[PDB]
Structures are given as C-alpha cells and as structure tokens.
Amino acid sequence: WKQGTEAAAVRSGDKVFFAGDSLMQGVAPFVQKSLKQQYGIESANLSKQSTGLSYPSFFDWPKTIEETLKKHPEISVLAVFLGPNDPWDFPVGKRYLKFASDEWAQEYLKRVDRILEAAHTHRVQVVWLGIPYMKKVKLDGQMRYLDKLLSEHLKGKIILIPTAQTLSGGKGRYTDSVNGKPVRYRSKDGIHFTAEGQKLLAEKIMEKIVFEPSTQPSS
Numbered sequence: 222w223k224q225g226t227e228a229a230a231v232r233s234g235d236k237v238f239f240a241g242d243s244l245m246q247g248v249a250p251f252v253q254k255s256l257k258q259q260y261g262i263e264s265a266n267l268s269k270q271s272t273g274l275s276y277p278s279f280f281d282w283p284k285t286i287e288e289t290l291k292k293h294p295e296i297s298v299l300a301v302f303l304g305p306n307d308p309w310d311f312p313v314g315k316r317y318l319k320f321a322s323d324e325w326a327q328e329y330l331k332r333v334d335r336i337l338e339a340a341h342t343h344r345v346q347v348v349w350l351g352i353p354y355m356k357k358v359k360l361d362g363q364m365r366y367l368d369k370l371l372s373e374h375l376k377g378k379i380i381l382i383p384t385a386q387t388l389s390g391g392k393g394r395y396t397d398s399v400n401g402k403p404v405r406y407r408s409k410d411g412i413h414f415t416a417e418g419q420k421l422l423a424e425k426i427m428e429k430i431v432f433e434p435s436t437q438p439s440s
Contacts, residue, residue, distance in 0.1 A: 222341040226380060228429045229346035231256075235297040237264040237430070240286060242272045244350070245302035247414055251423030252300070260432045265293070273307035274332045283335040290343045299340050300426060302350040304371075305412055308363035321366055330374050337378065348429055349375055350422070351383040354395040356411025361395060382425050388418060 231237065237256055239249035245268035256262040267289065272280040282303075290296055307329075310319050318325040340347045352368040355361035368385070375381055386392075388406050390399035398405045406418030414422070 222344055224341065224344075224346045224379060226377060228431045229298045229348055229380060230431050230433045231260065231262055231297055232433050233261060233435070234295060235262055236293060236295045237262060237298040237300065238286075238289060238293070238296045238345075239264065239266040239268055239300050239302075240282060241268045241300075241302040241350075242304070242306055243268070243270045243413060244305065244353075245300070246270060247419040248302060248350075248422045248426070249300070251420050252426050255423065255427050256430070259427075262432075265289070265296070268302070271306050273303050273305075274329060275307040275309055275311045277332075283332055283339070286336050287339045290339055290345060294343065296343075296345055298346050298348060298430065299336075300348040300350070301336070304352040304364055304367055305355070305360065308360070308367060320363070326370055329370070333371065333374065347379040348426065349379055349381055350426075351381065351385060353388050353407075354385045356395045356397075356407070360412070380429050382422075382429060384422055384425070387421065387425060388414075 237252070239245055239252070249266040249268055253264045253266060256264055267285065269280055272282060274282060277283065286299065308320055310317065312318070313328050316324070318328055337347060349371070351372060352364045355364050372381060389396045395411065397407055404417055405415050406421060407413070408415055
C-alpha cells in the first residue's frame, strides 16, 4: 500500500495517533488541540519519555503500534518523533550490535520497516519528523548520523517533516534563539523545546494534515 508522500488526509471520524519520546510529548498536545478545534478530529498521544527503537525491552514501539492499530481501526494517521535515546549499542538475540555499524543500521531500519508495515497494512498514513540539531557536540554528531540514516531510507515512502533548520532559522546548526526580536525555541538542556518551539513544530505537522469534506473527492 502506497500512502501519500506530501500530506495525510483525514475525514470526520478518523483519529490521529502520536508516538515517540519526549520530543513528541511536548509537540503532540498542540496538534491534538488544533485537530479537535479545526476539524473535530480526535487523537491518541502515547509518546513516552526515554523511549526509542533501540531498546524495546524498555518500551516496544513496533509492538505497541501493531497492537494499537489492531484495536483502533479508526486511526488513519500515525505521527512519529524520536531519536535522542537511541544512539547506543544494543543486543539482538544472541548478537551485540555496535552503534552505526552496518549490522546495527540494518537492524534499526528493520524496526523502522516493521512500523511502516503495520501502518500500511492498515492503510494508515505515516508522518515522521526529522531530528533537530543538538547543542551537545557528540550527541549532535550521533543525531546527524541517525537523521540521515532515517531520511535516506524513508524519503519517498512516507511524509517527512524536517525540523533542524526550522528550529534554527536556517543557520545550519544548533541555535538557542531565532530572530527583529529573538525567540527561544530550544530549552536550556539544548535538546528539547520551549512552548514556542513546540507550537512551531505543531504548526509544521498541521501543514501536512489535510481535512477532507464529505463531498470530496468529486465524481
């Protein structure tokens, strides 16, 4: 099944499902409110601090998504935002895979594909947010690697929303504030967002969600 790659369509009665770590936790509530007020569209926000794809033993996102879609066929959109908890070696069965090796990347993308397969089997449109620039230089290098691994694999398959340049006003690197008045989009920990940054990314998500009236499409 081939979803749209530019935007996701929602009809009355659809639900939007939000998944990911603390990056999603702060953004999703703003999108939930806009969906409800603008379109009457309900949503579920299951994002959870410290989670990711590398350690399903802590929290298993592929399995959670598989089970949520089975129980809630009214979900038509899955939005995903994660990354910063994942740049670590991890075990797989009998093996121990090292961060950014060929085998590590292959297993990481297999977990990504499991999420896409669950969604697409159920005709669910996937929206996936790119990883922001980080203030810590080592973490930023890990996230630039992971963001490129994900985007190279996902482009053309789903809807992608880059965040790094938007949050930096185009500077091509982490910034604390953006301009005539400076606005702070990032929190003091150099990873997460202020309320203004959360709202900005929620607006970027809403640009990718298109309400479909009952008289569309036309014959």
